Write an enzyme that holds these catalytic residues in place. Structure first.
Site, PDB file in Angstrom:
ATOM      1  N   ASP A   1     -16.767  27.503 -12.513  1.00  0.00           N
ATOM      2  CA  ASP A   1     -16.465  27.143 -11.130  1.00  0.00           C
ATOM      3  C   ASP A   1     -15.053  27.600 -10.774  1.00  0.00           C
ATOM      4  O   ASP A   1     -14.076  26.937 -11.139  1.00  0.00           O
ATOM      5  CB  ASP A   1     -16.627  25.636 -10.948  1.00  0.00           C
ATOM      6  CG  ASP A   1     -16.334  25.176  -9.532  1.00  0.00           C
ATOM      7  OD1 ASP A   1     -16.197  26.030  -8.639  1.00  0.00           O
ATOM      8  OD2 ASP A   1     -16.258  23.947  -9.324  1.00  0.00           O
TER       9      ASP A   1
ATOM     10  N   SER B   1     -10.688  37.897   4.509  1.00  0.00           N
ATOM     11  CA  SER B   1     -11.640  38.959   4.803  1.00  0.00           C
ATOM     12  C   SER B   1     -11.300  39.618   6.134  1.00  0.00           C
ATOM     13  O   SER B   1     -10.796  38.977   7.061  1.00  0.00           O
ATOM     14  CB  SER B   1     -13.070  38.401   4.839  1.00  0.00           C
ATOM     15  OG  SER B   1     -14.001  39.379   5.291  1.00  0.00           O
TER      16      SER B   1
HETATM   17  N1  LIG Z   1     -16.789  24.651  -6.264  1.00  0.00           N
HETATM   18  C1  LIG Z   1     -15.714  23.678  -6.236  1.00  0.00           C
HETATM   19  C2  LIG Z   1     -15.333  23.293  -4.808  1.00  0.00           C
HETATM   20  C3  LIG Z   1     -16.131  22.424  -4.077  1.00  0.00           C
HETATM   21  C4  LIG Z   1     -15.773  22.077  -2.784  1.00  0.00           C
HETATM   22  C5  LIG Z   1     -14.617  22.602  -2.226  1.00  0.00           C
HETATM   23  C6  LIG Z   1     -14.194  22.232  -0.809  1.00  0.00           C
HETATM   24  F1  LIG Z   1     -15.207  21.568  -0.179  1.00  0.00           F
HETATM   25  F2  LIG Z   1     -13.095  21.421  -0.879  1.00  0.00           F
HETATM   26  F3  LIG Z   1     -13.883  23.371  -0.123  1.00  0.00           F
HETATM   27  C7  LIG Z   1     -13.822  23.465  -2.958  1.00  0.00           C
HETATM   28  C8  LIG Z   1     -14.182  23.814  -4.248  1.00  0.00           C
END
Ligand SMILES: NCc1ccc(C(F)(F)F)cc1
Length: 330
Positions: A35, A199
């Site tokens: 992630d 972007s």
């Molecule tokens: N994949 C992790 C993640 C999940 C949600 C967000 C948000 F909602 F804060 F943009 C950022 C990062």
């Protein structure tokens, strides 16, 4: 040194990708969700409440000769979809595709939200955003990438996600046989702890390219593409019968429609997302309404270049002192 690991979609819709990771001595292999939108390495464990575990492989620190409890440390995290988890912290050895880090913080989940419990294919998360987002208290911990950086040949990792097919995460080198043409690099802002970039615009199908700045994050841990309402309305207006549904929570379209491609800009370069990548199938078994892979970011407050976008490209996460993002067609 370098590392290389295969990542595999968890289901037929590419809802997420899991990558085997070795933790402990002797190795315990868990399938983690890599992630780039978060910065915690947390795992289902022998400490997770029994009722919140349904088929996941669990980390057992008591069976690892190299595990050490990080005394006093706790963690608590909540994701943008409402998911959450929390527990205590061990340090242990962690290896990804041959690349080994000693003394990596392994956050043992004592409690997990329901969405993690019902997903038996995902044993945990491996966060690859910047360490300023890590939730360990009172001593903040470094990510796997940050700990490995010094020993990597090059302080980079690359994401090569497949469409309904396995892909590759590489650490420390750029596979020049994995992409076509040149890599276009663009500047990254680390101010919010994300791989945040800008972007240069978009196009729908074979339409004209609209030059406009779209700030957003490169997030392997988010399934869909979340963009401003103006962009998302202009895309779905080209699909016959498409509409935004309040009961479903997003744009849906007749499963019989064919979807146009979506192009996003990276500097002067263009990345084309084929229309088939935007089809996420019936909203329920047997339904003739299908869910769209491009949705509005208005409810979120940040634009997210999730797996829908990233799997159309070879993506370089360059963690040099000045970080950059590289995009290439493949
Ligand atoms: N994949 C992790 C993640 C999940 C949600 C967000 C948000 F909602 F804060 F943009 C950022 C990062």
């Amino acid at each position: 040194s370098t590392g290389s690991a295969t990542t595999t979609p968890i289901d037929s819709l590419d809802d997420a990708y899991i990558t085997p990771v070795q933790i402990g001595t002797p190795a315990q292999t868990l399938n983690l969700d890599f992630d780039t939108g978060s910065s915690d390495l947390w795992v289902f464990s022998s400490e997770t409440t029994a009722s919140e575990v349904d088929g996941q492989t669990i980390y057992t620190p008591s069976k690892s000769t190299t595990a050490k409890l990080l005394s006093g440390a706790t963690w608590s995290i909540s994701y943008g979809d409402g998911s959450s988890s929390s527990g205590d912290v061990y340090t242990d050895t962690v290896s990804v595709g041959g690349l080994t880090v000693t003394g990596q913080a392994v956050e043992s989940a004592k409690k997990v939200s329901s969405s993690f419990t019902e997903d038996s294919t995902i044993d945990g998360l491996l966060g690859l955003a910047f360490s300023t987002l890590n939730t360990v208290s009172p001593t903040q911990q470094k990510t796997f990438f940050d700990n490995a950086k010094a020993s990597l040949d090059s302080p980079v990792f690359t994401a090569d996600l497949g469409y309904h097919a396995p892909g590759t995460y590489n650490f420390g080198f750029i596979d020049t046989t994995a992409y076509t043409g040149s890599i276009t690099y663009t500047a990254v802002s680390t101010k919010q702890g994300f791989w945040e970039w800008t972007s240069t615009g978009y196009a729908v199908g074979s339409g004209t390219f609209k030059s406009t700045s779209i700030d957003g994050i490169a997030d392997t841990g988010t399934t869909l593409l979340y963009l401003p309402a103006t962009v998302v309305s202009a895309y779905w207006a080209q699909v016959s019968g498409a509409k935004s549904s309040s009961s479903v929570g997003g744009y849906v379209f007749p499963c019989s429609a064919t979807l146009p491609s979506f192009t996003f800009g990276v500097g002067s370069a263009r990345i084309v997302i084929p229309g088939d990548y935007i089809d996420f199938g019936p909203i329920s078994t047997g339904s003739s309404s299908c869910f769209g892979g491009i949705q509005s970011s208005a409810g979120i407050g940040i634009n997210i270049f999730g797996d829908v976008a990233l799997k159309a490209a070879f993506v370089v996460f360059n963690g040099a002192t000045t970080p950059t993002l590289g995009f290439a067609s493949k």
